Amino acid sequence: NRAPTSVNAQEVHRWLQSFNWDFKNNRTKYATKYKMANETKEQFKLIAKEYARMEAVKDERQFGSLQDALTR
Amino acid sequence: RAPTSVNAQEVHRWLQSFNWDFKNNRTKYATKYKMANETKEQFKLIAKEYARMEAVKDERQFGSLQDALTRLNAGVRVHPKWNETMKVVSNFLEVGEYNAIAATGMLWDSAQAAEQKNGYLAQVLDEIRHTHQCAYVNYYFAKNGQDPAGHNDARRTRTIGPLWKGMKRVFSDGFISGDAVECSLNLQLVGEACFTNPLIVAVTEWAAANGDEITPTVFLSIETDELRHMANGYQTVVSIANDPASAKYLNTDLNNAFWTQQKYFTPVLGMLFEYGSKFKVEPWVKTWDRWVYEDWGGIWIGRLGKYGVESPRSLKDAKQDAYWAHHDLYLLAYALWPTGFFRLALPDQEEMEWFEANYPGWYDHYGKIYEEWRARGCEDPSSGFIPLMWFIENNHPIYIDRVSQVPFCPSLAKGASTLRVHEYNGEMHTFSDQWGERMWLAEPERYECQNIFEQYEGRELSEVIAELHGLRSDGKTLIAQPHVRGDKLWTLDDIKRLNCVFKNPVKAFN
Amino acid sequence: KLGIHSNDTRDAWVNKIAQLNTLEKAAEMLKQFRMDHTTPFRNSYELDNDYLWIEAKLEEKVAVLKARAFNEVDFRHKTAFGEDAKSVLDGTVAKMNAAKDKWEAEKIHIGFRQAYKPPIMPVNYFLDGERQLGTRLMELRNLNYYDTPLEELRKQRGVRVVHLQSPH
């Protein structure tokens, strides 16, 4: 009942494909000979918050090495 | 609608008023002094800002460790002797950091002013950070080093040897047992200001000289937290400078605190630096003089003069006993090498020349002895020789000071050789100096620590080692070793065959 | 069976304390144990290497018994012996503040510990005394701490000097 619960990126991404909707002018603004399929999927189920966290962790180690040990 | 917020100082301005008066609003610990309830702190921090300033440091530190340092194999390309020395340095300091948590928790309970309490509190958290930092050094060297044994289990294997007992006296019990103010003096006024602070930096220097970039990364970060602790100790004095009891007790608790800390670090640190390294940074005699006499005894203590603080009366004594102290102790440490959790090495030719150059007379005493032990095979497991046997053969008993727990051998020492033996209510006691003797005489119930000869009396050496897990993963090879090479490592059987059985040296006076 | 953490002498006491089944007996054996093996005034040092561990193993037995023999009010204000915690506290503190010197003050403090250390006296009262008693003991001891030369101090302590050696 009152068990610590939360929501992750994959759980939100499950519904991301539905965010786009139809309307006459919903089309690319760029010239192209091709037509990208309306239901193409992506390999990684990310959302903005999770993308930022994983990149932030990388930055920490990188800049940490640069500013501390490598400089010393 | 300008973007607005609030910082730490703005909240801290009202921190002092957080405490309110009421009958039982007083310290729960016995003390002779009275800390002014209107004492202020130097750094205006709140819990959240504190966490942020520390989190930023962690970022750099762990970033360097996990990334660049690991990619450079920094955990391995370190001189064998230093890999071993760090097992002791990191873990022994770890307990100092850990008890400092309880110590400052006691100081926090002692302070009456909200701000003074907040200063101590900041240290409580720092000491927790430092405990985990020292823990991480051992953890990293165990995970990525040339010899994990000892680094991976010091918390239990350190209980086998005698050097650990004295460490607990200065960095465990000395930090938390007694008048809060006395503990404050052992930890902050003397411990950190005189030794800890300079030690941490010096260690990073010796570490770098011997290829160790792991320790500098961690220890230099610990170093950045020290200014808040200095202020705490300084503020401790300011807090009681007005109380009349201060003029009656401050100088004796300080002197006792000074003697207590130097008694252990004077010999131990010089030993770890000069004998636990290949490349030297600076002769310990020079270092000690600058730290204890020039910086602490002079500049630091001098600034507390306006508060009635006087230079420790036992200072002259400390300097006389100091010169050969670390050289004398290494002889005992190496002679009892099977009781440690680290591998030791005898000085090589370059080192012997270095020791003689910096300590005229070193060779004729210590040098000849080490060459004698080596030629006799103290490094070879098939020799059946452990230097402790040489002490017995030549009638050079080794005692443990009842107070400081520091091992001493009066018949061989080139340094202090005084010995006072007393009997009281069916128990013998051995002391190595007049200050420690007074401490026991005046406070016998404060010092009942059993020494290793008492606990191990009648026990065969290999049994004690096996029982306290002094073995490596294969369950046969000893953690401790009389050399730092990769072959010819001593095993429990090599020790068992020596038929070495401990005896209490004090019983010879019966 | 010799050993540091596990030895015959220790196994001997565990079986002994196990025979206990009365708060009275248990509490009494603890009070007596502390008189026989703790502090510089112990009756003997025969259990020097095991008394600290054995004591705790006794305290446990007494603790469990006192919990099943006392009521909520007493477990908090009454000693295992039946005394009234607060009374004992204020009394001992009275004597301490009256003590004429450090020699007298130390006897009171140490004696207090040997007799009322938990599970005997409730922790709250005990540590409260430890706070007041210790304060007085130090005030008397640390006054002119270095005045008395070692020769005399040794006499005052009543120690039997067996050997003195000093080149300087």
Added chain:
Amino acid sequence: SMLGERRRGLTDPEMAAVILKALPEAPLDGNNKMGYFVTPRWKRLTEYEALTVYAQPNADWIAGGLDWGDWTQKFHGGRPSWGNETTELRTVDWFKHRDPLRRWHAPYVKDKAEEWRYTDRFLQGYSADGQIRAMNPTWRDEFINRYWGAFLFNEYGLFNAHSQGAREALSDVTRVSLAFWGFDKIDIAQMIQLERGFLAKIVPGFDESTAVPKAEWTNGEVYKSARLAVEGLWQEVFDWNESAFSVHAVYDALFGQFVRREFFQRLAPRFGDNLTPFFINQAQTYFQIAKQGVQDLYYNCLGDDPEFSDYNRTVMRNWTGKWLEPTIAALRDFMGLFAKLPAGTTDKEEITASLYRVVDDWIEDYASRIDFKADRDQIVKAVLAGL
């Protein structure tokens, strides 16, 4: 110089060559796991456990200790540095405790720092977005400034109650948790002041001075029994376990939770105040964090100790009963605060439902763990009988 004068053994050709020459062919032991001898609480030993368990040098005479012998230096009188004598509770091993959140210093300051920096950003957005315009003026200048502020002294008092425990805790895992529980409390008190300081910047006649909230705390009437219960848990208790148990599994779980969650967190939103809840969101996150640790120590470890299960539960039921009374008293006094609220703010039907929420949660999370038979109806009645 560009190269510096100090030569480093890792990069200096000469020194490095010497070091490499002295190195063994392979590690002198394949066991590269620090803390390997520690009994894992979960599948595999965690970093939290390795870096924490056994840092405390306890000897075997202190349940769990791995060292031997007496301490090297003790208090005048003979009191040990650490000893069984500082707490009524007994156990087979003081190192059994484990923070469910596995917090050692690093993760701990990382989380609080993120909170600090987000807090700063939030305040900059709130003020820039003019959201203060929709906040009830009476609620701000009277209930936030006086009554909410006064509650900071309650939290501050609970904070200080941890001082002795920081010094007496019998293990490392327990000392770290205790320290963090106490630090989070002072944080909350400083956040209450932070909000008052923020209001002072965006509201022309608002005074951040603690004078008003302090007098309300010291000489007030709403928190009178509350303060009394605080001065007692802090300065009258000398048993570190009693102080931590009583403060977290009794008082703050009933009083504290009602005041924070059932009064301000419930009523503030009705006065157009999303500011205060922003800070209470933190206090609640912290309360729930600490709770997991409190439960693991007193129930999972002590209350269910293979040898002192019955004994410890008895002692805790004793403590629960001992402080359940001063707590209920602290509540009743607080109830008198509803009378100063504007008409129609809330009715007796709501407060009764909120109280049962606190009481029921308390029973489910604490009381029932030590087999303490508490009567929900009587408790609510006892407290509710103070409007």
Added chain:
Amino acid sequence: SMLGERRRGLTDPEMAAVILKALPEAPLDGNNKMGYFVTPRWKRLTEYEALTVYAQPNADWIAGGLDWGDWTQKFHGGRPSWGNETTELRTVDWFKHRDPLRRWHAPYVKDKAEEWRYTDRFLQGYSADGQIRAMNPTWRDEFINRYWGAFLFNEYGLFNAHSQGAREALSDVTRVSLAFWGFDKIDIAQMIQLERGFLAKIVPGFDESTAVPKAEWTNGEVYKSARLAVEGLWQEVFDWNESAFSVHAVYDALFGQFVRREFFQRLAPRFGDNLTPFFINQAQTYFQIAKQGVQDLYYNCLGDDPEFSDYNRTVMRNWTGKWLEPTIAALRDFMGLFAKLPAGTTDKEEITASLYRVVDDWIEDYASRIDFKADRDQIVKAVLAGLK
């Protein structure tokens, strides 16, 4: 092996010795400041500026560019990779813009990451604390699930309106700010879904499917004009500045602020909903962060351009008038939602006052900066017409 096979020049004795021997006695230039030639906005050059300004290889024919010559490869037809032709606005230097928060990638993901971890901590504390118990059922199932939910599509559309600008922005500083304004919008849309997903876990029967919120957005009346405006801003605007300006300095500044702050942020608390405001706090924080950047680019840099100030203001006034009508229509339809609330929730006076708050803030923070003559009561009366 313990040592490894690969020898490194920094640590390998032989290789390092070779390297050290070739080194000069001191640096071959004392100017160790990357980007020293960049005109600092503040006292000293910032890390943000050094790592960002002039990263874009523009030639001098695109205002402020330091390179020369035509692009190496253009579109079929001849359209340049980047060119002045992609926006009506003109300036002396496209590199003048500065994000007042000085956000380059590292600081940006750092803050969002902090917000993500705290959010997860908050939800775990909220659910464990059982605070959901006091939330009005109707507000939750009807207004949060359907109406707040439908708003995710509004934010998603505004996010997508930034796609062309990400490609056409004429400088590094503008592209980075634009990218971050857009990324913050998709984040909000995802946080609205996150909340619905959360409620679905702690409330039996709550369906996190987007079907209902989407049907409200695509076919409902309350958001009809909002959707029409968003579809236009996103797909009918080919000018990257008209898009960014109209989105942030017109539509979202008026409609967006009203929905988020004057409806949900303002009313949720009245129904025991401290959950939704937790996320709206993030949205408002993001809105205010973007506002500073939007103001610097359009007012400080373009609207006050020493050479094209008058011109740019004329163009932005033009865009404001163009998008203000569709925005009023969006707000007007949104007024229909108030009739759906339980009687007594709010009244016409509160609604009107809240409308004036948004309009007055817009006139102060945006309209007045370009001398757009906005009539506050005329705008509000036009919107109130939608009150059913």
